[PDB]
Scaffold this active site. Structure first.
Site, PDB file in Angstrom:
ATOM      1  N   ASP B 450       0.850  -1.184   0.000  1.00 32.31           N
ATOM      2  CA  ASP B 450       0.000   0.000   0.000  1.00 32.31           C
ATOM      3  C   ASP B 450       0.888   1.236   0.000  1.00 32.31           C
ATOM      4  O   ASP B 450       1.805   1.340   0.820  1.00 32.31           O
ATOM      5  CB  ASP B 450      -0.937   0.003   1.210  1.00 32.31           C
ATOM      6  CG  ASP B 450      -2.039   1.045   1.096  1.00 32.31           C
ATOM      7  OD1 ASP B 450      -1.791   2.116   0.505  1.00 32.31           O
ATOM      8  OD2 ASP B 450      -3.156   0.790   1.595  1.00 32.31           O
ATOM      9  N   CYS B 580     -21.039  21.574 -21.081  1.00 32.24           N
ATOM     10  CA  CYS B 580     -21.890  22.751 -21.218  1.00 32.24           C
ATOM     11  C   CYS B 580     -22.622  23.059 -19.918  1.00 32.24           C
ATOM     12  O   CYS B 580     -22.846  24.227 -19.584  1.00 32.24           O
ATOM     13  CB  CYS B 580     -22.893  22.545 -22.353  1.00 32.24           C
ATOM     14  SG  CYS B 580     -22.164  22.494 -24.002  1.00 32.24           S
TER      15      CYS B 580
HETATM   16  N1  LIG Z   1     -10.991   1.465   1.059  1.00 32.67           N
HETATM   17  S1  LIG Z   1     -10.078   2.415   1.817  1.00 32.67           S
HETATM   18  O1  LIG Z   1     -10.251   3.783   1.281  1.00 32.67           O
HETATM   19  O2  LIG Z   1     -10.441   2.389   3.251  1.00 32.67           O
HETATM   20  N2  LIG Z   1      -8.625   1.975   1.651  1.00 32.67           N
HETATM   21  C1  LIG Z   1      -8.167   1.392   0.395  1.00 32.67           C
HETATM   22  C2  LIG Z   1      -6.649   1.264   0.504  1.00 32.67           C
HETATM   23  O3  LIG Z   1      -6.117   0.638  -0.672  1.00 32.67           O
HETATM   24  C3  LIG Z   1      -4.941   1.332  -1.096  1.00 32.67           C
HETATM   25  N3  LIG Z   1      -4.761   1.318  -2.569  1.00 32.67           N
HETATM   26  C4  LIG Z   1      -5.502   1.983  -3.468  1.00 32.67           C
HETATM   27  N4  LIG Z   1      -5.023   1.726  -4.707  1.00 32.67           N
HETATM   28  C5  LIG Z   1      -3.968   0.897  -4.569  1.00 32.67           C
HETATM   29  C6  LIG Z   1      -3.023   0.252  -5.516  1.00 32.67           C
HETATM   30  N5  LIG Z   1      -3.119   0.452  -6.852  1.00 32.67           N
HETATM   31  N6  LIG Z   1      -2.059  -0.543  -5.008  1.00 32.67           N
HETATM   32  C7  LIG Z   1      -1.966  -0.739  -3.685  1.00 32.67           C
HETATM   33  N7  LIG Z   1      -2.809  -0.170  -2.809  1.00 32.67           N
HETATM   34  C8  LIG Z   1      -3.809   0.646  -3.222  1.00 32.67           C
HETATM   35  C9  LIG Z   1      -5.122   2.760  -0.619  1.00 32.67           C
HETATM   36  O4  LIG Z   1      -3.851   3.367  -0.366  1.00 32.67           O
HETATM   37  C10 LIG Z   1      -5.958   2.616   0.640  1.00 32.67           C
HETATM   38  O5  LIG Z   1      -5.119   2.610   1.802  1.00 32.67           O
END
Ligand SMILES: *NS(=O)(=O)NC[C@H]1O[C@@H](n2cnc3c(N)ncnc32)[C@H](O)[C@@H]1O
Ligand SMILES: [Mg+2]
Ligand SMILES: [Mg+2]
EC number: 6.2.1.45
Lengths: 76, 986
Positions: B450, B580
């Site tokens: 993450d 628009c």
């Molecule tokens: N659902 S949430 O908003 O509580 N958290 C979602 C969590 O997932 C992580 N995230 C989002 N997109 C990605 C990608 N492409 N790779 C790895 N992790 C990702 C967000 O940072 C959020 O913490």
């Protein structure tokens, strides 16, 4: 005959159908009332998702059965 | 009063009023095992007034199978006194305490009492009192793959919102005297028979706008009736209806009187016949306890099951239950009686927690009244499930071994998983994995990734984090926090800060994926889901998928060579307003917030980035002229922001903001009305400013107008930020500088294109200062940050939007709603997150069991706001026929080594019966049977990798481990046929 479609947000849709009708037909009637494209409709009866090409009878859908219309969600 | 910084995402689900009532409601929770601690966790995060725990029973080792706040050092210590310490750390605003004695009169201190791990006799004793003294009652229990919930909020419970949906609203075209409302331009009203709607701005029917609700009769998707309105006008025109949500009184039966005639909530219409069986079985489970000194049947014990089944017979007769008992099903509850699965506690615990909020807020429709559930398809079949295999072993997993066995426990321990996301779903998923013992074996491992960092609002539903973790990486904290929950995971977890996508395939490459057992998503966007899905299909890996939206959630399982993938089906696309409508003809506050967000970007972001590019990119002007959509705007930004409009003081920033006021809320409106006068008519004689078009009125600056003043402060403070000048808020300096503002004269021009050259741009470019004179000088762009109330971002958008709302006579919105819209914040809370995590892991055990029947898997959907759960078997992967063989159109591929072109052609003819006629790689054509014989003589002996490098005139990247190819070929009958792709293993 009459069947009911309950959505994930609590709405109830009533349809006039026959057991020989196809899922595609049922989806067309849902599109008329709700505007949801058939390809985006997720219908469930008795724990089974309805697929195009089959008929209501193929799922044992009978008078006043209840289907669920659901969606996928993207939060997390 | 409510800390919006912490509760932001949850407030967008429950609302301020609901949370105000929560902050006045004490909650009592009996039992602090897995189920009770999950309920208490969510309730604490939710923000009730206080939580009181009661569980004197001492901690046993098997309690750690799902209760994640108990360590092995706590064995023997009462569970409540061990758990209170760690529940008090979740939410500083929610005190948590323990009580050693339960007095019937002591219950009067709580608005809701949650009862777990309690006999039916004691339940009836508690509910008898609560039902008479206006105290909400909730009883839940987790028994192996079976669960039950009972709710009793009193026989006069008033629910003020029965679905949690926002009130419907829409623009009207006409109303007949008999009351037929016709929506505007084929716009669906979405109403149902029996709904109530108010009106506003209805022409020709003044009395209709007074706000009296009127019951609706739906005549069609675009029409409905409200009854006679002849006493009020001859014809209605235009206007807007708004749904009026009606409350409902919900009368609950007590546990004693409903025990005979229970009202069921069915979570699965495919298992309609089971809740009655379960109603008897859970009672018989409490009779068994009373008989054997509070002990439940032993795991998979036949003797205990026979005695249990006899209790069911006696109870079925005592309750006069006209039902033929299913022996095999009922006995299965006895076999699993001592099962304690974290997934079941997450599922039930999240749901019960939401029911507790319903009792204390009067929001959402509660379960009425018996919710009996099973995930019996999760029972393993690849391993022996007997009394010998499920017996206790003296470990933290005894509660799980009771259902799955010891042989299965080792399979869970050796999993290699990949968790994509460490937010809400991620934290719940990791907690479940820790309690299940995932990856605790020799060959087990967890990878979490993450790219985000912990923020305040995350703490409302990402419970692995704490306020002192703000600013740290989610994947690291979550890894550490889980090591405390299950020390067996120390060193077994590798955390990444990578964004899953094409750019990170060097980390998450072939070597990385080949080791994984499965992938689990915990994402908040569809783009990442679709990407992970493509990768799992390519590497033939199972994928566990889930999502939430407020009280709604869903789960989807992707089984290699069995089901379709996540991307096999289409979802409704993301809404986008017409250009628009935002640019000139708004009619909702959402249109002005989107406009204000673009204004924020256009004043404090885009021009700043062009200046810094002009000063650091050597050939920025040339490239921009060839690529930029509006080269004139780039040149003007640089010219304006570097010299002609460069401020030297905060006073000059105020003068600048004062000019932006007339430029976007006055001069532009005048030019619009000049091209489209208020009284102008279309080609059909109808007024141009009608229906979705609202006649705007320019604004005259007034320092004594909060919206005018707020825009000046926010805009001046952001302009100062761009240049580093120190901003101020003392109104005296604004009055000082603005009182002496001479606005330049403005006259609407002609010949301006309002939807419904070469020399000057070359000259202004030469008038720009050369970058040689500004070595090292940069400006600071404003990077939109919705969650920082000190940066003026939402202030500017709120004020800018509401000023445009004032132009077009739109109702303004406060910062709370404006932040929601401009920030695209997804409403969320802990309850839904726990529920999806539980459902996901109930499917996880199916993947590790290697279940091959698609009917055993289940995709889940729910909406906790209306007590709706429903499930469906996954869709099988589409199949295809080639030379009679069944080809899986999603999962099948031809795996070949880096052989020669000739060897590939021979392989397909002799081993597959396919005549290769064409071979392609990406856009490049590698081989075709019609190519001249000299082209082929030089390519047939080449290796695929060599053939690709030569045809592409480009060497293969060194870390490439595979190569994807496609072929056109004729089948054994000489007819062209579609066949799976080829994967060359380099
Ligand atoms: N659902 S949430 O908003 O509580 N958290 C979602 C969590 O997932 C992580 N995230 C989002 N997109 C990605 C990608 N492409 N790779 C790895 N992790 C990702 C967000 O940072 C959020 O913490
Ligand atoms: Mg974040
Ligand atoms: Mg998010």
């Amino acid at each position: 005959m009459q069947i009911f479609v309950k959505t994930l947000t609590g709405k109830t849709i009533t349809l006039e159908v026959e057991s020989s009708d196809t899922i595609d037909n049922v989806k067309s009637k849902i599109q008329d009332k709700e505007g949801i494209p058939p390809d985006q409709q997720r219908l469930i009866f008795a724990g089974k998702q309805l697929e195009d090409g089959r008929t209501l009878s193929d799922y044992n859908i009978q008078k006043e059965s209840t289907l669920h219309l659901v969606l996928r969600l993207c939060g997390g | 009063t409510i800390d919006e910084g912490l509760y932001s995402r949850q407030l967008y689900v429950l609302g301020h009023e609901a949370m105000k009532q929560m902050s006045q409601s004490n909650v009592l929770i009996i039992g602090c095992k897995g189920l009770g601690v999950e309920i208490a966790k969510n309730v604490c995060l939710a923000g009730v007034k206080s939580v009181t725990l009661y569980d004197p029973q001492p901690t046993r080792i098997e309690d750690l199978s799902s209760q994640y706040f108990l360590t092995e050092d706590d064995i023997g210590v009462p569970r409540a006194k061990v758990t209170v310490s760690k529940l008090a750390e979740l939410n500083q605003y929610v005190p948590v305490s323990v009580v050693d004695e339960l007095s019937t009169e002591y219950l009067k201190n709580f608005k809701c009492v949650v009862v777990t791990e309690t006999s039916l006799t004691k339940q009836l004793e508690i509910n008898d009192f609560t039902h008479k003294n206006h105290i909400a009652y909730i009883a839940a229990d987790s028994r192996g793959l079976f669960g039950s919930i009972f709710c009793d909020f009193g026989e006069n419970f008033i629910c003020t919102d029965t679905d949690g949906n926002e009130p419907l609203t829409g623009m009207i075209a006409s109303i007949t005297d008999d009351g037929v409302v016709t929506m505007l331009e084929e716009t669906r009203h979405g109403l149902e028979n029996g709904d109530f709607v108010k009106f506003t701005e209805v022409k020709g029917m003044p009395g209709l706008n007074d706000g009296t609700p009127r019951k609706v009769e739906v005549k069609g998707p675009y029409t409905f009736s409200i009854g006679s309105v002849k006493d009020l006008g001859s014809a209605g025109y235009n206007g807007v209806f708004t749904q009026v949500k009606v409350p409902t009184k919900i009368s609950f039966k007590s546990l004693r009187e409903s025990l005979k005639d229970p009202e069921y909530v069915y979570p699965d219409f495919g298992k309609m016949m089971r809740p009655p069986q379960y109603h008897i079985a859970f009672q018989a489970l409490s009779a068994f306890a009373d008989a054997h000194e509070g002990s439940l049947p032993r795991p998979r014990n036949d003797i205990d099951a026979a005695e249990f089944f006899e209790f069911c017979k006696k109870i079925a007769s005592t309750l006069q239950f006209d039902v033929e008992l299913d022996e095999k099903l009922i006995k299965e509850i006895s076999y699993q009686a001592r099962g304690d699965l974290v997934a079941m506690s997450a599922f039930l615990g999240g749901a019960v927690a939401q029911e507790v909020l319903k009792a204390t807020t009067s929001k959402f429709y509660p379960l009425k009244q018996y919710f009996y559930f099973d995930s019996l398809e999760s029972l393993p079949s690849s391993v022996t499930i007997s009394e010998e295999t499920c017996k206790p072993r003296g470990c933290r997993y005894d509660g799980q071994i009771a259902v799955f066995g010891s042989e299965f426990q080792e399979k869970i321990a050796s999993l290699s998983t990949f968790l994509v996301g460490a937010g809400a779903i991620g934290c719940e998923m990791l907690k479940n994995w820790a309690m299940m013992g995932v990856a605790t074996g020799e060959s087990g491992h967890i990878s979490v990734t993450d790219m985000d960092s912990i923020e305040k609002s995350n703490l409302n539903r990402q419970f692995l984090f704490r306020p002192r973790d703000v600013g740290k990486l989610k994947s690291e904290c979550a890894s550490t926090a889980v090591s405390i929950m299950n020390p067996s995971l120390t060193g077994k977890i590798t955390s990444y800060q990578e964004r899953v996508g094409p750019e990170s395939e060097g980390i998450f490459g072939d070597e990385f994926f080949e080791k994984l057992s499965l992938v689990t998503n915990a994402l908040d966007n569809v783009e990442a889901r679709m990407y992970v899905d493509r990768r799992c299909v390519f590497f033939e890996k199972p994928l566990l998928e889930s999502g939430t939206l407020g009280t709604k959630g869903n789960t989807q399982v992707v089984v290699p060579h069995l089901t379709e993938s996540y991307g096999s089906s289409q979802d409704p696309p993301e809404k986008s307003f017409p250009i628009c409508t935002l640019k000139n003809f708004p009619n909702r506050i959402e249109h002005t917030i989107a406009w204000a967000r673009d204004l924020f970007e256009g004043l404090f972001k885009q021009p700043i980035d062009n200046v810094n590019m002009y000063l650091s990119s050597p050939n920025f002007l040339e490239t921009s002229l060839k690529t930029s959509s509006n080269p004139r705007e780039v040149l003007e930004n640089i010219r304006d922001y570097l010299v002609t409009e460069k401020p030297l003081s905060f006073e000059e920033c105020i003068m600048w903001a004062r000019l932006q006021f007339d430029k976007f809320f006055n001069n532009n409106i005048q030019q619009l009305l000049f091209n489209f006068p208020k009284d102008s008519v279309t080609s059909t004689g109808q007024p141009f400013w009608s229906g979705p078009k609202r006649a705007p009125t320019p604004l005259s600056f007034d320092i004594h107008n909060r919206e005018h003043f707020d825009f000046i402060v926010a805009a001046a403070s952001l302009y100062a930020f761009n240049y580093g000048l120190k901003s101020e808020t003392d109104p005296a300096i604004y009055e000082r500088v603005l009182a002496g503002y001479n606005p330049p004269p403005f006259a609407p021009k002609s010949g301006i294109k309002i939807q419904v050259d070469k020399q000057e741009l070359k000259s202004i470019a030469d008038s720009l200062p050369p970058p040689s004179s500004l070595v090292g000088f940069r400006l600071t762009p404003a990077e939109f940050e919705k969650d920082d109330d000190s940066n003026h971002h939402i202030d500017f958008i709120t004020a800018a939007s509401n000023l445009r709302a004032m132009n077009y006579d739109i109702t303004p919105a406060d910062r709370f709603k404006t932040k929601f819209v401009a920030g695209k914040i997804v409403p969320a809370m802990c309850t839904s997150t726990a529920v999806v995590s539980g459902l996901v892991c109930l499917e996880l055990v199916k993947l590790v069991d290697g279940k091959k029947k698609i009917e055993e898997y289940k995709n889940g959907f729910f909406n906790l706001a209306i007590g709706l759960f429903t499930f469906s078997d996954p869709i099988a992967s589409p199949k295809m026929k080639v030379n009679g063989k069944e080809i899986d159109k999603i999962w099948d591929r031809y795996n070949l080594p880096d052989c020669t072109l000739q060897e590939l052609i021979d392989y397909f003819q002799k081993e597959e019966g396919l005549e290769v006629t064409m071979l392609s790689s990406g856009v490049s054509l590698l081989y075709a049977n019609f190519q001249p014989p000299k082209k082929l003589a030089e390519r047939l002996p080449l290796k695929i990798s060599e053939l690709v490098e030569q045809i592409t005139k480009k060497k293969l990247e060194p870390f490439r481990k595979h190569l994807v190819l496609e072929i056109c070929c004729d089948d054994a009958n000489g007819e062209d046929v579609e066949v799976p792709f080829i994967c060359i293993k380099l």
